[PDB]
């Protein structure tokens, strides 16, 4: 489904296939097993560009995952000082 294979672009940051996932009806608010939605997963990984355009896209900045932690504070928890200044 759109859902999964948008979580995996996240996760990957290949924006590439964000930009069209999107354009194709994507959902954003997609959640993995853990509750992670794209913006946790890209967030996880470092990818400031695919955050950039999921938020660009309307994702809940504000989502909270399984452990409760929102993609900004799993930036501050990995000491990602560009990603936090982005979700801040
Ligand atoms: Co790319
Ligand atoms: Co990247």
Known sequence: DLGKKLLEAARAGQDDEVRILMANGADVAAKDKNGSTPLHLAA????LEVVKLLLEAGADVNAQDKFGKTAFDISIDNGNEDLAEILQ
């Open 44 to 47: 996880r990984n470092g990818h």
